[PDB]
Coordinates of all heavy atoms in Angstrom, one line a residue:
Chain C
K70 N -22.1 114.8 65.2 CA -21.1 114.0 65.9 C -20.7 114.6 67.2 O -20.4 115.8 67.2 CB -19.9 113.7 65.1 CG -20.1 112.6 64.1 CD -20.0 111.2 64.8 CE -19.9 110.1 63.8 NZ -19.9 108.8 64.4
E71 N -20.7 113.9 68.3 CA -20.2 114.4 69.6 C -19.3 113.3 70.2 O -19.7 112.4 70.9 CB -21.4 114.6 70.5 CG -22.5 115.4 70.0 CD -23.3 114.8 68.9 OE1 -23.6 113.6 69.0 OE2 -23.7 115.5 67.9
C72 N -18.0 113.5 69.9 CA -17.0 112.5 70.2 C -16.0 113.2 71.1 O -15.4 114.2 70.7 CB -16.3 111.9 69.0 SG -17.5 111.4 67.7
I73 N -15.7 112.6 72.3 CA -14.8 113.1 73.3 C -13.4 112.5 73.0 O -13.3 111.3 72.9 CB -15.3 112.9 74.7 CG1 -16.7 113.3 74.9 CG2 -14.4 113.6 75.7 CD1 -17.4 112.7 76.1
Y74 N -12.4 113.3 72.9 CA -11.1 112.8 72.7 C -10.2 113.2 73.8 O -10.2 114.3 74.3 CB -10.5 113.4 71.4 CG -11.3 112.8 70.2 CD1 -12.4 113.5 69.7 CD2 -10.9 111.6 69.7 CE1 -13.0 112.9 68.6 CE2 -11.5 111.1 68.6 CZ -12.6 111.7 68.1 OH -13.3 111.2 67.0
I75 N -9.4 112.2 74.3 CA -8.8 112.3 75.6 C -7.3 112.2 75.5 O -6.8 111.3 74.8 CB -9.3 111.1 76.5 CG1 -10.8 111.3 76.7 CG2 -8.6 111.1 77.8 CD1 -11.5 109.9 77.0
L76 N -6.6 113.1 76.1 CA -5.1 113.1 76.2 C -4.7 112.9 77.6 O -4.9 113.8 78.5 CB -4.6 114.4 75.6 CG -5.1 114.7 74.2 CD1 -4.6 116.0 73.6 CD2 -4.8 113.6 73.2
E77 N -4.0 111.8 77.9 CA -3.5 111.4 79.2 C -2.0 111.4 79.2 O -1.4 110.6 78.5 CB -4.1 110.1 79.6 CG -3.6 109.7 81.0 CD -4.2 108.4 81.5 OE1 -5.0 107.8 80.7 OE2 -3.9 108.0 82.6
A78 N -1.4 112.3 79.9 CA 0.0 112.4 80.0 C 0.4 112.0 81.5 O -0.2 112.4 82.4 CB 0.6 113.8 79.7
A79 N 1.4 111.2 81.6 CA 1.9 110.7 82.9 C 2.5 111.9 83.7 O 2.8 112.9 83.1 CB 3.0 109.6 82.7
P80 N 2.5 111.8 85.0 CA 3.0 112.9 85.8 C 4.4 113.3 85.4 O 5.2 112.5 84.9 CB 3.0 112.3 87.2 CG 1.9 111.4 87.2 CD 1.9 110.8 85.8
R81 N 4.7 114.6 85.6 CA 6.0 115.3 85.2 C 6.0 115.5 83.7 O 7.0 116.2 83.2 CB 7.2 114.6 85.6 CG 7.2 114.1 87.1 CD 7.7 115.3 88.0 NE 7.1 116.5 87.8 CZ 5.9 116.9 88.3 NH1 5.3 116.2 89.1 NH2 5.4 118.1 88.0
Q82 N 5.1 115.1 82.9 CA 5.1 115.3 81.5 C 4.4 116.6 81.1 O 3.5 117.1 81.7 CB 4.4 114.1 80.7 CG 5.1 112.8 80.9 CD 4.4 111.7 80.3 OE1 3.3 111.8 79.8 NE2 5.0 110.5 80.3
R83 N 5.0 117.3 80.1 CA 4.5 118.5 79.5 C 3.8 118.2 78.2 O 4.3 117.5 77.4 CB 5.6 119.5 79.3 CG 6.3 119.9 80.6 CD 7.6 120.6 80.3 NE 8.2 121.0 81.5 CZ 9.4 121.7 81.6 NH1 10.0 122.0 80.5 NH2 9.9 122.0 82.8
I84 N 2.6 118.8 78.0 CA 1.8 118.4 76.9 C 2.0 119.4 75.7 O 1.9 120.6 75.8 CB 0.3 118.4 77.2 CG1 0.1 117.5 78.4 CG2 -0.5 117.9 76.1 CD1 -1.3 117.5 79.0
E85 N 2.4 118.8 74.6 CA 2.6 119.6 73.3 C 1.6 119.1 72.3 O 1.8 118.0 71.7 CB 4.0 119.4 72.8 CG 5.1 120.0 73.7 CD 5.3 119.2 74.9 OE1 5.2 117.9 74.9 OE2 5.6 119.8 76.0
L86 N 0.6 119.9 72.1 CA -0.4 119.6 71.0 C 0.1 120.3 69.8 O 0.5 121.4 69.8 CB -1.8 120.2 71.4 CG -2.8 120.2 70.3 CD1 -3.3 118.7 70.0 CD2 -4.0 121.1 70.7
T87 N 0.0 119.5 68.7 CA 0.4 120.0 67.4 C -0.9 119.9 66.5 O -1.4 118.8 66.2 CB 1.5 119.3 66.7 OG1 2.6 119.3 67.6 CG2 1.9 119.9 65.4
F88 N -1.3 121.1 65.9 CA -2.6 121.1 65.2 C -2.3 121.4 63.7 O -1.6 122.4 63.4 CB -3.5 122.1 65.8 CG -4.9 122.0 65.3 CD1 -5.5 120.7 65.3 CD2 -5.6 123.1 64.8 CE1 -6.8 120.6 64.9 CE2 -6.9 122.9 64.4 CZ -7.5 121.7 64.4
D89 N -2.7 120.5 62.8 CA -2.4 120.6 61.4 C -3.5 121.2 60.6 O -4.5 120.5 60.4 CB -2.0 119.2 60.9 CG -0.8 118.6 61.6 OD1 0.0 119.4 62.2 OD2 -0.7 117.4 61.6
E90 N -3.4 122.4 60.3 CA -4.6 123.1 59.6 C -4.6 122.7 58.1 O -3.5 122.5 57.5 CB -4.5 124.6 59.7 CG -5.8 125.3 59.2 CD -7.0 124.9 60.0 OE1 -6.9 124.7 61.2 OE2 -8.1 124.9 59.4
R91 N -5.8 122.7 57.5 CA -6.0 122.2 56.2 C -6.2 123.4 55.2 O -6.2 123.1 54.0 CB -7.1 121.2 56.1 CG -7.4 120.7 54.7 CD -6.3 120.0 54.0 NE -6.7 119.5 52.7 CZ -5.8 119.1 51.8 NH1 -4.5 119.1 52.0 NH2 -6.2 118.6 50.6
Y92 N -6.5 124.6 55.7 CA -7.0 125.6 54.8 C -6.6 127.0 55.3 O -6.7 127.3 56.5 CB -8.6 125.6 54.8 CG -9.2 126.4 53.7 CD1 -9.1 126.1 52.4 CD2 -10.0 127.5 54.0 CE1 -9.6 126.9 51.4 CE2 -10.6 128.3 53.0 CZ -10.4 128.0 51.7 OH -11.0 128.7 50.7
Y93 N -6.0 127.8 54.4 CA -5.4 129.1 54.7 C -6.2 130.2 54.3 O -6.3 130.6 53.1 CB -4.0 129.1 54.1 CG -3.1 128.0 54.5 CD1 -3.0 126.9 53.6 CD2 -2.3 128.0 55.6 CE1 -2.1 125.8 53.9 CE2 -1.4 127.0 55.9 CZ -1.3 125.9 55.1 OH -0.5 124.9 55.4

Side-chain angles (χ1 to χ4, degrees):
Chain C
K70 278 288 193 181
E71 306 73 40
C72 317
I73 310 161
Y74 290 94
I75 294 155
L76 306 177
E77 182 177 0
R81 311 275 47 87
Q82 295 177 355
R83 298 170 177 176
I84 307 174
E85 295 72 34
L86 170 73
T87 306
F88 194 50
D89 300 338
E90 188 64 32
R91 179 60 178 163
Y92 193 67
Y93 304 94

